RNA sequence: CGUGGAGGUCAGUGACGAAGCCUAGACCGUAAGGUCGGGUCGAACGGCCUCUAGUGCAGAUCUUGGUGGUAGUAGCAAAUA
RNA sequence: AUAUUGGCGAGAGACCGAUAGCGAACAAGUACAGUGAUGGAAAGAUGAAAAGAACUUUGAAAAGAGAGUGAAAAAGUACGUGAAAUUGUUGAAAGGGAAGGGCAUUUGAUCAGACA
């Protein structure tokens, strides 16, 4: 269960790779605006990669919701988790990557007690 | 003495794979040789036959 | 060369006495960083310039 | 030592290694691929025949 | 083709390819190299995937060695499991 | 140091030399000789706008 | 949006594993990027408010280092054996 | 009272962190080069402790396989971590004179989430 929302539509599901990120290892896939005066990518020719522009902005009513319908919140300890006690249908706590296993089981205990959804409960747990 | 011989033998790996003829070969090759990059040959004589 | 002067012969004698690979017991000392004779010389392989 | 990929039972298997080994790498890749998956005795016989010029290592790459 | 215009060539190759492709796929599926169904008891959907953990429990249950468990990680898993068993011991 | 990257003796190799025209260390027998010398882009060269 | 260092704060994270690295495993962002899972690792490192700057690379016949194809190729045929 | 990139002795730093900081963190003005004046580098990291792998076995030997030390040899004097280029093997797949990229979907492989 989550706070009600419409369908989560993503106007561009594919990642915006950089122009020649495939041709060269030295060119990363991190997006970069092509600044060349004769860049067919910048001039927006037919048959080239799409570039980010504000038209692809997600719906404001849905912009930060995960597929479960929650906005993700990073928690590192029980104290951080309890800030979502009154916001349980609008937020789901995600446990930070560096929280140790014992502190993670403490977090899961408190989260289940408060009913807060935890995004990655499987975590470092190898019971 | 066996440990000493082992360490002496196990050290020479990097020098041998550089073909360093022992401990006495410390020939250094320059990064680039300016005589190899002659310039624009064909005017006058050139730097080599 | 043959028919030397004494000064040259003394410098060559120093060079001969230095023509030594590392003594092994050096390698066994505590906190030893010396592993090879980095200042080793050879007659065909680097001249000593008198 | 860490071996490469391995996909057999260790109790019923045996390993051998030679490292930093002064032989041509291309030719060794051709001769090792000539005896990949072969029966061991048959592979040894085949290599002894290769020394004897009765059979040849196929050079593929 | 241009020498045999009355034989299908592309279509014959595509039929042969689809036959050989799913014969190979079925061979892989029968040997079980493919992962089981999501509803299977042997599947790991929704649960963490770890080569090290799988090898540790395969050695405890008692080969593939491209997937190898280091003695370092084996000791770490044993220690973590001791902690987890102590936690279940304080639970019960 | 204001002498940092400047202590090297080097001059550009000229034009038509099939190498970049950065100053290169003269002399020989050391591996350092022939290497780009002064620019900020060069290993061992000055930093851009040395901090004063 | 991101990076090195500084003041403040979370009595923040951390040997029950910090950082880093690898990963057709996941998620958020139009994007800069951010988050999580697994492996590896083994000792430190983050969020926020600010301060500061040697702060972001695809190029400069860029610099230094490393590595390929070429390629098991040219070649190892002067000086009678 | 003033000056002080030298010498000697100190104390600091919003500095640099091994391609940086002095050229030099290391037997660095060393190695090396040049007749000479001069030019002038590369190079730090096993582990808490060498406990640096006794012994057996295959091999002429290097080494290999066992064994063993160590918390860990996924730390073996090529040693913390161990990227990319590049390469080997394995598994999958494609290929009738490019490869790559855009949109869409087939197919195969893989994979996350939820309880009127």
Swiss-Prot record, chain B:
Region (Disordered): 1-49
Subcellular location: Nucleus, Nucleolus
UniProt biased composition (Basic and acidic residues): 1-28
Oligomeric form and interacting partners: Associated with nucleolar and cytoplasmic pre-60S particles. Directly interacts with RLP24.
Family in the record: Belongs to the TRAFAC class OBG-HflX-like GTPase superfamily. OBG GTPase family. NOG subfamily.
Record's miscellaneous remark: Present with 28000 molecules/cell in log phase SD medium.
Function comment: Involved in the biogenesis of the 60S ribosomal subunit.
Name under which the protein is recorded: Nucleolar GTP-binding protein 1
Gene source species: Saccharomyces cerevisiae (strain ATCC 204508 / S288c) (Baker's yeast)
Gene: NOG1
Curated annotation (Swiss-Prot), chain C:
Keywords recorded for this protein, A-Z: Cytoplasm, Ribonucleoprotein, Ribosomal protein
Quaternary context: Component of the large ribosomal subunit (LSU). Mature yeast ribosomes consist of a small (40S) and a large (60S) subunit. The 40S small subunit contains 1 molecule of ribosomal RNA (18S rRNA) and 33 different proteins (encoded by 57 genes). The large 60S subunit contains 3 rRNA molecules (25S, 5.8S and 5S rRNA) and 46 different proteins (encoded by 81 genes). eL39 interacts with YIH1.
PANTHER family: LARGE RIBOSOMAL SUBUNIT PROTEIN EL39, RIBOSOMAL PROTEIN L39E
Major place of residence: cytoplasm
Function: Component of the ribosome, a large ribonucleoprotein complex responsible for the synthesis of proteins in the cell. The small ribosomal subunit (SSU) binds messenger RNAs (mRNAs) and translates the encoded message by selecting cognate aminoacyl-transfer RNA (tRNA) molecules. The large subunit (LSU) contains the ribosomal catalytic site termed the peptidyl transferase center (PTC), which catalyzes the formation of peptide bonds, thereby polymerizing the amino acids delivered by tRNAs into a polypeptide chain.
Organism lineage: Eukaryota, Fungi, Dikarya, Ascomycota, Saccharomycotina
Organism: Saccharomyces cerevisiae (strain ATCC 204508 / S288c) (Baker's yeast)
Cellular component, GO, one term: cytosol
Full protein name: Large ribosomal subunit protein eL39
BP terms from Gene Ontology: cytoplasmic translation
Biased composition (Basic residues): 6-19
UniProtKB/Swiss-Prot annotation, chain D:
Protein name per UniProt: Large ribosomal subunit protein uL22A
Free-text function comment from the UniProt entry: Component of the ribosome, a large ribonucleoprotein complex responsible for the synthesis of proteins in the cell. The small ribosomal subunit (SSU) binds messenger RNAs (mRNAs) and translates the encoded message by selecting cognate aminoacyl-transfer RNA (tRNA) molecules. The large subunit (LSU) contains the ribosomal catalytic site termed the peptidyl transferase center (PTC), which catalyzes the formation of peptide bonds, thereby polymerizing the amino acids delivered by tRNAs into a polypeptide chain.
Highest taxon listed in the record's lineage: Eukaryota
MF GO annotations: structural constituent of ribosome
Binding partners and assembly: Component of the large ribosomal subunit (LSU). Mature yeast ribosomes consist of a small (40S) and a large (60S) subunit. The 40S small subunit contains 1 molecule of ribosomal RNA (18S rRNA) and 33 different proteins (encoded by 57 genes). The large 60S subunit contains 3 rRNA molecules (25S, 5.8S and 5S rRNA) and 46 different proteins (encoded by 81 genes). uL22 is associated with the polypeptide exit tunnel.
Transmembrane segments: none
Compartments in which it is found: Cytoplasm
Main location (coarse class): cytoplasm
GO cellular component: cytoplasm; cytosol; cytosolic large ribosomal subunit; preribosome, large subunit precursor
Keywords for this protein: Cytoplasm, Isopeptide bond, Phosphoprotein, Ribonucleoprotein, Ribosomal protein, Ubl conjugation
Covalent crosslink: Glycyl lysine isopeptide (Lys-Gly) (interchain with G-Cter in ubiquitin): 45
Residues of the full protein shown: 2 to 62 of 184
Keyword Phosphoprotein tagged: yes
Curated annotation (Swiss-Prot), chain F:
PTM comment, free text: N-terminally acetylated by acetyltransferase NatA.
UniProt modified residues of type Omega-N-methylarginine: 43
Domain of life: Eukaryota
Effect of residue 46 to E: Leads to a slower growth at higher temperatures but allows RPL4 assembly into the 60S subunit
Cell compartments where the protein resides: Cytoplasm; Nucleus
Further information: There are 2 genes for uL4 in yeast.
Role noted for this protein: Component of the ribosome, a large ribonucleoprotein complex responsible for the synthesis of proteins in the cell. The small ribosomal subunit (SSU) binds messenger RNAs (mRNAs) and translates the encoded message by selecting cognate aminoacyl-transfer RNA (tRNA) molecules. The large subunit (LSU) contains the ribosomal catalytic site termed the peptidyl transferase center (PTC), which catalyzes the formation of peptide bonds, thereby polymerizing the amino acids delivered by tRNAs into a polypeptide chain.
Domain notes: The eukaryote-specific C-terminal extension harbors a nuclear import signal and delivers the ACL4-uL4/RPL4 complex to the pre-ribosome, triggering uL4 release from ACL4 and incorporation into the 60S ribosomal subunit.
Homology family: Belongs to the universal ribosomal protein uL4 family.
Protein name per UniProt: Large ribosomal subunit protein uL4A
Protein's organism: Saccharomyces cerevisiae (strain ATCC 204508 / S288c) (Baker's yeast)
């Amino acid at each position: 269960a989550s706070l009600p929302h419409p369908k989560i539509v993503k106007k561009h599901t594919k990642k915006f790779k950089r122009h020649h990120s495939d041709r060269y290892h030295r060119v990363a896939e991190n997006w970069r605006k092509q600044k060349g005066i004769d860049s067919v990518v910048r001039r927006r020719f037919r048959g080239n990669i799409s570039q980010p522009k504000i038209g692809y902005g997600s719906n404001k009513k849905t912009k930060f919701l995960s597929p479960s319908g929650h906005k993700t919140f990073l928690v590192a300890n029980v104290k951080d988790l309890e800030t979502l006690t009154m916001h349980t249908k609008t937020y789901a706590a995600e446990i930070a990557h560096n929280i140790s296993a014992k502190n993670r089981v403490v977090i899961l205990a408190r989260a289940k007690a408060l009913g807060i959804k935890v995004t990655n409960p499987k975590g470092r747990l190898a019971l | 003495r066996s440990k000493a011989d082992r360490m002496a033998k196990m050290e020479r790996r990097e020098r041998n794979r550089h073909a360093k003829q022992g401990e006495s070969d410390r020939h250094n090759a320059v990064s680039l040789s300016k005589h190899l990059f002659s310039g624009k040959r064909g005017v006058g004589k050139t730097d080599f036959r | 060369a043959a028919q030397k002067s004494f000064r040259i012969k003394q410098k060559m004698a120093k060079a001969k006495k230095q023509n030594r690979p590392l003594p092994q017991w050096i390698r066994l000392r505590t906190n030893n960083t010396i592993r090879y004779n980095a200042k080793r010389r050879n007659w065909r392989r680097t001249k000593m310039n008198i | 030592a860490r071996y490469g990929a391995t996909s057999t039972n260790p109790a019923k298997s045996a390993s051998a290694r030679g490292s930093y080994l002064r032989v041509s790498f291309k030719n060794t890749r051709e001769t090792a691929q000539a005896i990949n998956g072969w029966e061991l005795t048959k592979a040894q016989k085949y290599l002894e025949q290769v020394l004897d010029h009765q059979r040849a290592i196929p050079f593929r790459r | 083709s241009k020498n045999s215009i009355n034989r299908p060539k592309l279509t014959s190759n595509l039929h042969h390819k689809v036959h050989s492709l799913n014969k190979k796929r079925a061979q892989r599926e029968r040997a079980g190299l493919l992962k089981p169904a999501r509803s299977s008891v042997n599947s790991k959907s929704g649960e963490i995937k770890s080569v090290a953990l799988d090898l540790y429990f395969q050695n405890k249950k008692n080969s593939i060695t491209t997937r190898t468990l280091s003695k370092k990680r084996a000791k770490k898993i044993e220690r973590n499991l001791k902690y987890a068993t102590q936690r279940k011991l304080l639970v019960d | 140091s204001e002498k940092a990257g400047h202590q090297t003796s080097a001059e550009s190799w000229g034009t038509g030399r099939a190498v970049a025209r950065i100053p290169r260390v003269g002399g020989g027998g050391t591996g350092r000789s022939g290497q780009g010398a002064f620019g900020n882009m060069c290993r061992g060269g000055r930093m851009f706008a040395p901090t004063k």
